[model samples]
Target chain A: AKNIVYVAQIKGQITSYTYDQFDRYITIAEQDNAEAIIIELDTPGGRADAMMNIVQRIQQSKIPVIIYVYPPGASAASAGTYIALGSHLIAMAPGTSIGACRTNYFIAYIKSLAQESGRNATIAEEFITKDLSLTPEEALKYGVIEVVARDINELLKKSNGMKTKIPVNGRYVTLNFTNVEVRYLAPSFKDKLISYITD
Target chain B: ILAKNIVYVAQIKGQITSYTYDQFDRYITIAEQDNAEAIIIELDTPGGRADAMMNIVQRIQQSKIPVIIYVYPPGASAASAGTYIALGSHLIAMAPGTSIGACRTNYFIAYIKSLAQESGRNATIAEEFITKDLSLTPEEALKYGVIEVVARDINELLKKSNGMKTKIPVNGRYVTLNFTNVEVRYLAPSFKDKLISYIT
Candidate 1:
């Protein structure tokens, strides 16, 4: 976590392939008692089961979990979209997009996320129902994500010192990323095999 | 509730029309006569009767006590006449799932804009609420300056609005809101008011 910040990059489809891998970093976050867990995310959505599990883990974390729609062309769709909404704070890259989630499945869940996060639940519902996608600037303008940055450096810097309540205990925590350098976490062989054989 | 600091609470719901105003007036005068501290209009409505709404706005303007237009109860809304009433109010608040805006009748664009400017709300969004039929969730309302607080319920609204300052409708003065030890008294429409609301 380079001082007080930790980021885990989760790319590609978030499926059974991601369950254990995603769980590992959050465990480390708890063990090390980090200030925040940033997910440098890029995905095209995946299985509801895997997404729900990851979402539950994120909500349960005592650490603030932030989801960033990383890279220039990356977008978080469907399950990935819901993951972003469940976060304590969500940010995106300049060219990144968010939305096109299935509203028919988790309408109540997504709306609740926006409500709890103090966001535009009405628009958040459209992301699922209307299958909408918004550019980073538009997302920010529409009461969605609050930050827009080009990369990790800017994301951390822009979000520094923001206070958020971790859902686990409803305690307010402040983030400090002063002169930051972030470390990335990857999947283990066992986690990979467990996903592969199951698939 | 202390007589001087009595906060009279009332609700407005469903379709808005002439009867709503009569019902509204009954409570306002009742509270005024009782020398209540403040008046809270818990509102949820679709846009309606511009004539009635205009009168409601005037009544709000002439009120001696602080008037709070609380767009309330989860999933309720304040559109059209509801928008006009809220904008005319001293301070505006909304519940979490409640929404406000979308008063698309262009006739009152400038009229509502004047109220928005007077009340220290965003005139730009006020225009959009009519011209573009723009709607906002509680968070969006707060972000755009259409509302000051997104309270969860009456008790929370009371506590959160305690320290904020509001304008005096009758005179050019500001009053500090105090909700300490305040008891809420809910009001209902009189038989006459209910009949008036029965107007088509």
Candidate 2:
């Protein structure tokens, strides 16, 4: 098709449901065939592993994913930090920040994920290191956010003539891109052993 | 071994600066080198050297130390350059009567001082060096995941800080500013007041 947008907004808490909803949305979008996923994000971040899952899909998705931390005063922090990194493009409004990715904070979150999945935390840590490598600019540099923008129009102009449809003041607009047969390249157990240490 | 809990440092007191550049830098360097965890700053004063404040902030940033600046002892305040240091830290805490921020700079010396005077290389050079630093408004800082919480006392701070873990269920890697509108009674005049005083 031409160009379209997919919107997945998790305004508050990033829970398992959030991940499931995100997956469902992306799966449906992939079914529909989209050019891009434009996520309007306003969050403080969420589960480390779940964020990683979403990031994995976003990074590998055939369709480009553009995450907009929009409507002013939002952040793609912590787990959101990595998710932002996974995107092909990232846009932000006037008052947005992306940092505080200290290992001190993620330790417990990693421990919890290990327990929840019944998998060793080693796998999760390995995934994080791999993801972190994709983002090489230390703590201050988030490779995900391409430009800091004020609004959707500005974002479109920066996107170099991508079709843009912003949600009206009170009304919400939903767009999905799912035509390119969604493929899941699940991380192998052994991939962690090799690339995990490299990151 | 003495259990080291908090790295407390400050540059301002009544009429004396408790923290010095060398002393503050040394403590911050060691804390960051050791990753001694948390650092608390008890602040109360009109303000201090701007360059000094930047040095302290840079050290904290490089060290990757989570810093909390608290104005306490009932009626303490952090103003001018002190406010910059407080905001530069990872986190900020305040006592009930404590005050933070009231001043802003335009670098008149750096940009204009040279134009007006024949000999102004030092001011020009200093301004050029300082101009690249990040300047954040109080509201912008709060919006940008800068400061974490506000409290009335140490006990309240501890209560809010403890039991806090990463992730939204456990309050996440970062916490939202508690939606409590604080009424700041500035002993020093407001920005407008200062401007008018300078003009008048």
Candidate 3:
């Protein structure tokens, strides 16, 4: 198979449905031997366990996982912030904001995501402990996210030829995001059912 | 002496810097000395220093009369630190075609990727506009607790504000008021050159 970028969107609440959708996309991306997996997200946090599951899956993937908080006026608060931190590359659109992850239960989990992704763990802790809400500039300033793009096209352009390390088996392997064809993956009927019920 | 209720209106145009803050303080002091029923701030600013904004916020918090921030003019904006100042007002008002927000911490990045289409490095040049500035329309701002009321003009603003209860911090206590028959007295623009020179 040729080098391909699997672009999947995860909007609204993160539940079992969101996890299942992500799992399905990762599986397909892996099966297709995708060079990169891009997840466009706009969420106001969700189930802690579900977020952890998505985090772990991204960590284990052989493909570079890029998480983007997209659109103008969108936010990736709470659990969404954790997921963005866990990804290999994080991107945000202009006018988008992230944070307010502060809470007792998720502090440790979010901090671990920061540590694992080689981000500022202390600042990530502030997201939970201090209720820090950041605009895109602050996210980049604190090293919470890597790229800030205006739109999907801009995100792809900036990400092109970028280098990222992905976990393969038990070891980390370096991958390049270059010369790849982007494809949008739709959710399965079962996944749609899960989202409907959750809604 | 004017028998009708007096509302002192002060206009703050352009950037809200330290100088603007100083000028605003003078207006507040005069309004206080005159025992104005309320103070209406006609605001249109793109923000200023954090310290200056905080000082204004504290001033509003300590006001004896209700400090109303109206984002005036058709295309004027109450952006960045202006949003915080407007929020501090006892009652926030906005005019038609006016907007608020984009009050994020500041900074910018300019990077150019390969722009030549024929170089085989056909890369899209990206200009990232990531900032703390989060802007909103008047209607959207109202829903999100950014502003209290929206009016077409000063007449409507005064009419709508009548009978509306507002608060003032007095000796560690908040005194509320049911506004009635409020009258507007527009303060003449003085120190215009000083204000312009300081900002420019």
Candidate 4:
């Protein structure tokens, strides 16, 4: 668990179900002398409490934890906003999006939980409300993610700090500061126009 | 020995059709809710509806499953919309001879660009949108950060995604081919054909 990354194979209830896993992972990675922890994420906005814990982990990690939305078709929305904003680097591919901070379901879940526990719902409401002010663009401008990269290639390319990658040959590659260009790949000229229509 | 339960969504034919939105949504939603280890979108499309593709993409963005758009068979194409959906996924793969083109925004981009060219306030707005959406010109997507590498096949893509995420070495990230080095030996394709006949 103490290394540059700890893979959480599941998602839901961001803080309660997974905070221990995160803590253990960060602790191990940091113990192993890793400069950062990479959270390979693919989640539909989780619980608000979970979002808070995720941010806490980021703020407290020994080194910056890079939050990468990998593969291709994944999103970081709602609670994901918290994680993405708290991250050192946030990346997406061509089809990825990071918006729509709506959280009706999340509020209900939290309020119900507070009622069940006989705890004041006021505390939960206050925190969630305050967190809502951080818009997506604001997150970007505030350096939530220094750069929006295409794939891992561009993520490494535009990475302005130290990073780690594993190779096919089973060796680890380390990247210090880099000046490589980040390129976005779209469709060809002949087929470009008809690509965006929704059904 | 164990087998993990998962769902399979297929789009084996590279056909772009009107029903793409429903198909994409049904598959993605099922995969996410089922808690499948991974969601696989087998692609072989020549590109299709932008709005439909966006629907699929928006769903993928909102869902939690790690998605992979794997284009299989020789000559299969995840062109236009395919390229966009491929990029949106958490992981993307393709068989040999399968190709992805750089076709993100269509008329929206051109309309914005045209407005920018005209000497008016709209031009300013268009210019702003163009610059903001993509820091480079349409021609510059290859040079800047947009899509990732153009892999010859899946093994290559896997190699790049090996370390933490999708392939490409940590230190040796793939730089797009340098177009500046290419010499224009002929005019555009149509003109080239006409000139070729004369030379022969």
Taken in order, the candidates have interface RMSDs of 24.5, 26.0, 30.1, 17.6
Q: State each model's C-alpha RMSD to the native.
A: 17.8, 21.3, 22.8, 21.3
Put down candidate 1 lDDT per residue, B39-158, tens digits, no spaces.
Answer: 788899876635688888888888777789999867789987888889888889898878898743456888878889988899999988888779999998999998888886565677
Q: Which lDDT tens digits does candidate 1 get at residues A63-99?
A: 7888988866787888788888888888998768899
Regions of candidate 2 where Cα sits further than 4 Å from its true position? A46-48, A101-144, A161-199, B1-200
| A128-184: candidate 3 lDDT, tens digit per residue | 777888888888898888889864445666876655533555655455444444455
Better by TM-score, candidate 4 or 1: 1
Give the clashing pairs for model 1. Answer: none
- Which is the better candidate, 1 or 3, if ranked by TM-score? 1
Lowest summed-lDDT stretch of 10 residues in model 3 chain B?
Answer: B111-120
TM-score of chain A of each: 0.87, 0.56, 0.87, 0.53
lDDT of 4 by residue, A163-185 (tens): 32212123333434232211112
Model 4 ranges off by over 4 Å: A1-15, A101-144, A162-199, B1-200
Candidates arranged by TM-score, highest first:
1, 3, 4, 2
Total clashes in model 4, counting residue pairs 3 or more apart in sequence or in different chains: 51
lDDT for each residue of candidate 3 in B115-153, tens digit (9 for 90 to 100): 111111111211111233356777866675456679865
Compose the digit string of candidate 2's lDDT tens values, residues B1-200: 01223322332343213234454465555546554334455566564444566666555444445555665544565555565555555556665545554423576333223321221112332233235433333334445443444655433554455443311211123433221211111111235433433453
Q: Model 2: per-residue lDDT, tens digit, A34-147?
A: 545567676665344467677666645655567777544565556665565445566776556543332655655544444432333443354444433222222223223355
The parts of candidate 3 lying over 4 Å away from their true place are A46-48, A101-105, A165-175, B1-200
Computed on alpha carbons, the lDDT of every model, listed in order, comes to 0.76, 0.46, 0.68, 0.45
